[PDB]
Amino acid sequence: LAPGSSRVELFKRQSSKVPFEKDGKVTERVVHSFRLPALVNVDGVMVAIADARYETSFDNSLIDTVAKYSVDDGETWETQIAIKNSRASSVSRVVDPTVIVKGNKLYVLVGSYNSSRSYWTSHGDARDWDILLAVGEVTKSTAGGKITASIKWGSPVSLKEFFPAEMEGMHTNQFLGGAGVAIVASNGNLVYPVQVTNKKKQVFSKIFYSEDEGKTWKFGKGRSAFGCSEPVALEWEGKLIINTRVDYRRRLVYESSDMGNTWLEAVGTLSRVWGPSPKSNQPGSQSSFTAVTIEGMRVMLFTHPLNFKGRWLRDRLNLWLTDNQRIYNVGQVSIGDENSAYSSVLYKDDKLYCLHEINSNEVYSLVFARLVGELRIIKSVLQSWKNWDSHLSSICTPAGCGPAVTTVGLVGFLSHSATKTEWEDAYRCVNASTANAERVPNGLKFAGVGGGALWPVSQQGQNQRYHFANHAFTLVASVTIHEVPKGASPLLGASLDSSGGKKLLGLSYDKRHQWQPIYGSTPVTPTGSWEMGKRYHVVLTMANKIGSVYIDGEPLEGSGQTVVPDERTPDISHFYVGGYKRSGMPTDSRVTVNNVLLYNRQLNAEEIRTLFLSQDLIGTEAH
Ligand SMILES: OC[C@H]1O[C@@H](O[C@H]2[C@H](O)[C@@H](O)[C@@H](O)O[C@@H]2CO)[C@H](O)[C@@H](O)[C@H]1O
Numbered sequence: 183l184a185p186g187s188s189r190v191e192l193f194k195r196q197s198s199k200v201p202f203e204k205d206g207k208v209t210e211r212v213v214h215s216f217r218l219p220a221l222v223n224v225d226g227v228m229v230a231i232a233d234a235r236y237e238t239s240f241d242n243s244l245i246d247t248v249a250k251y252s253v254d255d256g257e258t259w260e261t262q263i264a265i266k267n268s269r270a271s272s273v274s275r276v277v278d279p280t281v282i283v284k285g286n287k288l289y290v291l292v293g294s295y296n297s298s299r300s301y302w303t304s305h306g307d308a309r310d311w312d313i314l315l316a317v318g319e320v321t322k323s324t325a326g327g328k329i330t331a332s333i334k335w336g337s338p339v340s341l342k343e344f345f346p347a348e349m350e351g352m353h354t355n356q357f358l359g360g361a362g363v364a365i366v367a368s369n370g371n372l373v374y375p376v377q378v379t380n381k382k383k384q385v386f387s388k389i390f391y392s393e394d395e396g397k398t399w400k401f402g403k404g405r406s407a408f409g410c411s412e413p414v415a416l417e418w419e420g421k422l423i424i425n426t427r428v429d430y431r432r433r434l435v436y437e438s439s440d441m442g443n444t445w446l447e448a449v450g451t452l453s454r455v456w457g458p459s460p461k462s463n464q465p466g467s468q469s470s471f472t473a474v475t476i477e478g479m480r481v482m483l484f485t486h487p488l489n490f491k492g493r494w495l496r497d498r499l500n501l502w503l504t505d506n507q508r509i510y511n512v513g514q515v516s517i518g519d520e521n522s523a524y525s526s527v528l529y530k531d532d533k534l535y536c537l538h539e540i541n542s543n544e545v546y547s548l549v550f551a552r553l554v555g556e557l558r559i560i561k562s563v564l565q566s567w568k569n570w571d572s573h574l575s576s577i578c579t580p581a582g583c584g585p586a587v588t589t590v591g592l593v594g595f596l597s598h599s600a601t602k603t604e605w606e607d608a609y610r611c612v613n614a615s616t617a618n619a620e621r622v623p624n625g626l627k628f629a630g631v632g633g634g635a636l637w638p639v640s641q642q643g644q645n646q647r648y649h650f651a652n653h654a655f656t657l658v659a660s661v662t663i664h665e666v667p668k669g670a671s672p673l674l675g676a677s678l679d680s681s682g683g684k685k686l687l688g689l690s691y692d693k694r695h696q697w698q699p700i701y702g703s704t705p706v707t708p709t710g711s712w713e714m715g716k717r718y719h720v721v722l723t724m725a726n727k728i729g730s731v732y733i734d735g736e737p738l739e740g741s742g743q744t745v746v747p748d749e750r751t752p753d754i755s756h757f758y759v760g761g762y763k764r765s766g767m768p769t770d771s772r773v774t775v776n777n778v779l780l781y782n783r784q785l786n787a788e789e790i791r792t793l794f795l796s797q798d799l800i801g802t803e804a805h
C-alpha cells in the first residue's frame with residue numbers, strides 16, 4: 183500500500199453478522215468467511231456486494247449474497263442480505279455474483295445449487311443447477327436534515343429458458359457469470375461475460391446480453407478457446423475487450439465489435455502480457471478491469487496477484503495502468519507477503535478505492551482501502567505521457583510545415599536521460615541496461631569488448647509488456663561509427679536468444695565499408711557503403727513474418743525476406759543497441775546512438791520520410 187494510503191477490515195471474518203432468514207424467522211448470525219467482492223457507485227450511493235460463507239470457506243457449502251451501503255463515502259455502512267438460497271439441504275447456495283449498474287437499479291446474476299458436494303466443473307449434468315436474476319431498487323431521502331437511503335430487493339427470476347441445448351459442435355451443460363462487475367454498453371444493452379461447460383466437461387467464455395431492460399436474453403455466436411474461465415469485460419472505442427483466466431498458462435485477451443458474434447485475439451496490445459506466477463505454471467485468478475476518465479484522458483485499470491508462493495495462495499496483489507499502448511506497473515496494493523487474491527476497484531468524484539480479499543489458514547476477510555497515493559502516482563505518469571505526445575505533435579517538420587510526426591502507437595523512447603547504468607524510458611515503463619557507456623546529447627557513445635545496451639522483452643519475466651513485438655513492430659534510431667572494425671560488428675537488432683547469436687532481424691557493418699543486414703537465419707549478403715564520422719538514419723520493420731531495413735529513408739538489398747519460418751510464433755528475448763552488451767562475444771563496436779523509438783505496428787512510407795527528415799528536432803535535451 184503506497185505512502186499516504188490507508189484501510190480498514192470491513193467484512194470481518196468470524197465477527198461481522200447478517201440477517202439470516204429461515205421459516206419466516208430472522209436472526210443475526212456470525213459468518214465464517216467473506217469472498218468474491220464487487221464494489222460500485224449508484225447515483226451517489228456506494229454499494230459493496232459479496233459471498234457470505236456461513237460455515238466454512240469450502241466452495242460447496244452454505245452461502246447467501248450479502249450487501250452493504252453508505253452515503254458518506256465509506257465512513258459508515260448499513261447491512262443486508264440481497265439474495266437468499268433455496269433452503270433445501272445443509273449445502274444449498276447462490277454463487278459467483280456478477281453486478282451491473284443502470285439508472286438507480288442493481289442487476290445481480292447468480293448460480294443456484296441445492297445439494298452437490300462436488301466442484302461444478304466436474305458435474306456430468308445439470309440436475310442440481312439453476313441460473314437467476316435479482317433486481318434491487320435504490321432511493322434517496324433527507325428526513326432529518328441529513329442524507330439517507332434505502333434499498334429494496336425483488337424476488338429472483340430464473341433465466342434458464344434462454345439457454346439452448348446445443349452450440350456449434352457440442353452439447354450444453356451449465357453456465358455462470360464471471361464474478362465482479364459488468365457493464366452497460368453505449369447502446370443501452372446489459373452485457374454479462376459468462377463461463378460455460380459442455381457435455382465433455384470443457385470450459386469456455388461467451389457474451390450474454392439484453393435489449394429490453396432484462397426481460398429477455400441472448401447469446402452471441404462466437405467463443406474463446408477451450409480453457410478460458412471467469413472472464414471480465416469493458417468497452418473501448420466501440421469494441422468489447424474480454425480479459426480471461428487460464429490455469430497453468432499466460433492470460434488470453436480478445437476483441438469483438440459485434441456483441442460477441444465474432445472474436446479476435448488481441449495480439450498487438452494486451453494478450454499474453456500477464457502471467458499467473460513467476461514461471462506461469464500455477465492456478466490463475468479473478469480480476470478487476472474497468473475504463474475511466476482521469477484529468478481528461480480515458481484509460482484502463484487492471485489488478486491480479488503475483489503468486490510467489492504457489493498453488494492457490496496468491497500473495498502480492500498488484501495494480502496496472504494503460505492506454506492500449508504503454509503499460510505501467512503502479513505497484514503493490516496488499517501489505518507485505520500476505521495472501522490476497524480477489525479484488526474490486528472504484529473511481530468516484532475524483533477519489534480511488536479498492537475492496538479486496540485477505541487469507542490466513544483458509545479463513546477470509548474483505549478490507550476496504552483508500553488509494554490516495556496510487557492516484558497521485560497515476561496522475562504524475564499521465565501528465566508525462568500527455569506532455570511528450572504534445573511536444574512531438576507540435577514540431578514544424580520541414581517542407582509552411584510538412585506532415586506531423588506520428589505518435590499513434592508509440593510505446594517507448596530512449597533519449598537525453600540516463601544514469602550510470604540505465605538509459606531511461608521517457609514514457610517511464612521499461613528502462614534499458616548498459617555497459618562502457620559515456621553520456622552525450624540525446625543519446626550514448628559506446629566502446630570496447632562488452633559495450634552496448636539491452637532493452638528487455640521476454641527478459642521482463644512474469645509480466646511482459648512488449649509481447650506485441652512477436653507479431654509486429656517498428657524500431658528507429660540515428661547512428662555514427664568511429665572506427666573501422668576487424669571483422670563484422672553489431673549496430674542494432676532483435677534477438678531470439680540471450681547471447682544475441684540467434685537473430686530475428688538486425689544490422690551490422692564491416693571492414694570493407696559495407697552494411698550487413700541480417701534476415702533471420704538466411705545467409706548474409708553485404709551491400710551499400712558508409713564513411714566514418716558520418717551520421718545515418720536507421721529503421722527496422724517486421725509484420726506478417728516479413729522484415730525490412732532502411733538507411734536514410736531508403737530500403738536496402740535483401741529487404742522483404744522471411745524472418746519467421748511459418749512454423750511457430752516467435753519468442754523475442756531483447757533488442758540490442760550499439761553492441762551485444764556481452765563480454766563473452768568477440769566484437770568491439772565504437773559508435774554513438776541517439777533517439778531510439780519503439781512502435782507497436784509497421785509504419786507507412788510517409789511516416790518514415792518525416793521521421794528521417796526531422797531527426798535534428800526531436801531530442802529530449804531542452805527539457
Ligand atoms: O484454496 C481454496 C480454493 O480451493 C479451490 O479448490 C481446489 C482445492 O483446494 C484442492 O484441494 C483440489 O480439490 O482442487 C480444487 C480445484 O478445483 C477452489 O477452486 C477455489 O474456489 C478456492 O476455494
Ligand SMILES: CC(=O)N[C@H]1[C@H]([C@H](O)[C@H](O)CO)OC(C(=O)O)=C[C@@H]1O
Pocket residue numbers: 241277278301302303360361377411412467468
Ligand atoms: C467453485 C465455484 O462455483 N466458485 C469459485 C470460482 C469458480 O470456480 C469460477 O467462477 C468458475 O471456474 O472461482 C474460485 C476460484 O478462485 O477457484 C472461487 C469460487 O468459489
